[PDB]
Design an enzyme around this catalytic site. Structure first.
Site, PDB file in Angstrom:
ATOM      1  N   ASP A  25       0.799  -1.207   0.000  1.00 45.94           N
ATOM      2  CA  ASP A  25       0.000   0.000   0.000  1.00 45.94           C
ATOM      3  C   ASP A  25       0.852   1.287   0.000  1.00 45.94           C
ATOM      4  O   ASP A  25       1.363   1.733   1.043  1.00 45.94           O
ATOM      5  CB  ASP A  25      -0.951  -0.028   1.205  1.00 45.94           C
ATOM      6  CG  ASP A  25      -2.001   1.065   1.150  1.00 45.94           C
ATOM      7  OD1 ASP A  25      -2.882   1.056   2.012  1.00 45.94           O
ATOM      8  OD2 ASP A  25      -1.960   1.926   0.240  1.00 45.94           O
ATOM      9  N   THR A  26       0.958   1.903  -1.175  1.00 44.60           N
ATOM     10  CA  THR A  26       1.725   3.137  -1.348  1.00 44.60           C
ATOM     11  C   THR A  26       1.063   4.338  -0.680  1.00 44.60           C
ATOM     12  O   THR A  26       1.721   5.361  -0.458  1.00 44.60           O
ATOM     13  CB  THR A  26       1.940   3.459  -2.841  1.00 44.60           C
ATOM     14  OG1 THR A  26       0.670   3.661  -3.485  1.00 44.60           O
ATOM     15  CG2 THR A  26       2.693   2.335  -3.526  1.00 44.60           C
ATOM     16  N   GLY A  27      -0.229   4.215  -0.361  1.00 44.14           N
ATOM     17  CA  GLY A  27      -0.967   5.265   0.357  1.00 44.14           C
ATOM     18  C   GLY A  27      -0.869   5.212   1.880  1.00 44.14           C
ATOM     19  O   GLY A  27      -1.456   6.051   2.567  1.00 44.14           O
TER      20      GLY A  27
HETATM   21  C1  K60 Z   1      -6.792   6.656   2.902  1.00 40.67           C
HETATM   22  C2  K60 Z   1      -5.258   6.655   2.925  1.00 40.67           C
HETATM   23  C3  K60 Z   1      -4.714   8.079   2.868  1.00 40.67           C
HETATM   24  C4  K60 Z   1      -4.655   5.937   4.143  1.00 40.67           C
HETATM   25  N1  K60 Z   1      -5.124   4.527   4.207  1.00 40.67           N
HETATM   26  C5  K60 Z   1      -4.433   3.644   3.252  1.00 40.67           C
HETATM   27  C6  K60 Z   1      -5.370   3.279   2.092  1.00 40.67           C
HETATM   28  O1  K60 Z   1      -4.582   2.673   1.049  1.00 40.67           O
HETATM   29  C7  K60 Z   1      -6.505   2.391   2.610  1.00 40.67           C
HETATM   30  C8  K60 Z   1      -6.082   0.948   2.908  1.00 40.67           C
HETATM   31  C9  K60 Z   1      -7.282   0.148   3.389  1.00 40.67           C
HETATM   32  C10 K60 Z   1      -7.871  -0.802   2.552  1.00 40.67           C
HETATM   33  C11 K60 Z   1      -8.977  -1.523   2.971  1.00 40.67           C
HETATM   34  C12 K60 Z   1      -9.519  -1.317   4.232  1.00 40.67           C
HETATM   35  C13 K60 Z   1      -8.946  -0.372   5.070  1.00 40.67           C
HETATM   36  C14 K60 Z   1      -7.831   0.363   4.653  1.00 40.67           C
HETATM   37  N2  K60 Z   1      -7.626   2.207   1.683  1.00 40.67           N
HETATM   38  C15 K60 Z   1      -8.836   2.754   1.866  1.00 40.67           C
HETATM   39  O2  K60 Z   1      -9.138   3.533   2.767  1.00 40.67           O
HETATM   40  C16 K60 Z   1      -9.919   2.342   0.910  1.00 40.67           C
HETATM   41  C17 K60 Z   1     -10.887   1.474   1.736  1.00 40.67           C
HETATM   42  N3  K60 Z   1     -11.169   0.359   0.849  1.00 40.67           N
HETATM   43  C18 K60 Z   1     -12.193  -0.570   1.148  1.00 40.67           C
HETATM   44  C19 K60 Z   1     -12.883  -1.242   0.135  1.00 40.67           C
HETATM   45  C20 K60 Z   1     -13.894  -2.150   0.442  1.00 40.67           C
HETATM   46  C21 K60 Z   1     -14.254  -2.384   1.764  1.00 40.67           C
HETATM   47  C22 K60 Z   1     -13.583  -1.724   2.794  1.00 40.67           C
HETATM   48  C23 K60 Z   1     -13.960  -1.976   4.235  1.00 40.67           C
HETATM   49  F1  K60 Z   1     -15.092  -2.621   4.310  1.00 40.67           F
HETATM   50  F2  K60 Z   1     -13.071  -2.730   4.849  1.00 40.67           F
HETATM   51  F3  K60 Z   1     -14.092  -0.828   4.874  1.00 40.67           F
HETATM   52  C24 K60 Z   1     -12.569  -0.815   2.479  1.00 40.67           C
HETATM   53  C25 K60 Z   1     -10.387   0.380  -0.231  1.00 40.67           C
HETATM   54  O3  K60 Z   1     -10.361  -0.360  -1.195  1.00 40.67           O
HETATM   55  O4  K60 Z   1      -9.491   1.515  -0.182  1.00 40.67           O
HETATM   56  S1  K60 Z   1      -5.206   3.954   5.725  1.00 40.67           S
HETATM   57  O5  K60 Z   1      -5.456   2.545   5.655  1.00 40.67           O
HETATM   58  O6  K60 Z   1      -6.282   4.677   6.359  1.00 40.67           O
HETATM   59  C26 K60 Z   1      -3.810   4.215   6.514  1.00 40.67           C
HETATM   60  C27 K60 Z   1      -2.766   3.278   6.435  1.00 40.67           C
HETATM   61  C28 K60 Z   1      -1.533   3.494   7.086  1.00 40.67           C
HETATM   62  C29 K60 Z   1      -1.364   4.659   7.806  1.00 40.67           C
HETATM   63  C30 K60 Z   1      -2.373   5.588   7.892  1.00 40.67           C
HETATM   64  C31 K60 Z   1      -3.604   5.394   7.251  1.00 40.67           C
HETATM   65  O7  K60 Z   1      -1.951   6.637   8.656  1.00 40.67           O
HETATM   66  C32 K60 Z   1      -0.586   6.391   9.041  1.00 40.67           C
HETATM   67  O8  K60 Z   1      -0.269   5.087   8.502  1.00 40.67           O
END
Ligand code: K60
EC number: 3.4.23.16
Lengths: 99, 99
Positions: A25-27
């Protein structure tokens, strides 16, 4: 290897005797793993994303194997639905974004 | 370009003649931008994240130029902590992970 993004970039990781699937996860600044009872000292932290914040436990200098590549660093443990390999470890395994 | 991960992969995007910074986010299925006006019809949607679920507006077939590369696709607008470019558009611009 090269990972396309047609699907979620899930890879196998190892942390102790636990194998798990995790997102490259690059984000994510930090690596966030689903709830697990790791040994050692930790400190509480809040991290924020879509929907708000979760409380996590920060463990330092934890070795993790990511697709057979060795890494060691800070891991945040808490109630995440998905294991997230963040940039702190992505760099250690030589991971870049390319287009 | 090739983008390393010692810093956040923030890039300049162009949408509706406006320039914004957005995070290339391989852990995000969907592109989600902070509150803004976009023209045309949208649909109410809810999406999840690490902190819970939020309401967003879904706009389809929106052109975005990301670091000079053209995409046309779905953009969700809502209370994301930062503008994120997700896999739906990363695939369009040919982005892969490599290590
Ligand atoms: C929004 C970004 C700026 C930050 N996020 C990283 C994203 O890449 C997240 C990763 C993630 C993926 C799935 C669930 C939870 C987190 N991605 C997302 O927020 C969205 C959420 N998501 C998703 C899709 C379907 C269902 C769901 C669920 F049901 F789980 F909520 C989430 C998706 O595909 O991308 S983060 O996960 O919130 C994150 C991680 C590490 C960190 C941090 C924040 O702060 C300091 O270190």
């Amino acid at each position: 290897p090269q990972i396309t993004l047609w699907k979620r970039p899930l890879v196998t990781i190892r942390i102790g005797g636990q194998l798990k699937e995790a997102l490259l996860d690059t984000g994510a600044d930090d690596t966030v793993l689903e709830e697990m009872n790791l040994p050692g000292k930790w400190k509480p932290k809040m991290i924020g994303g879509i929907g708000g914040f979760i409380k996590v436990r920060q463990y330092d200098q934890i070795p993790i194997e990511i697709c057979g590549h060795k890494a060691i660093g800070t891991v945040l443990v808490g109630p995440t639905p998905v294991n997230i390999i963040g940039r702190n470890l992505l760099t250690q395994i030589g991971c870049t974004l390319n287009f």
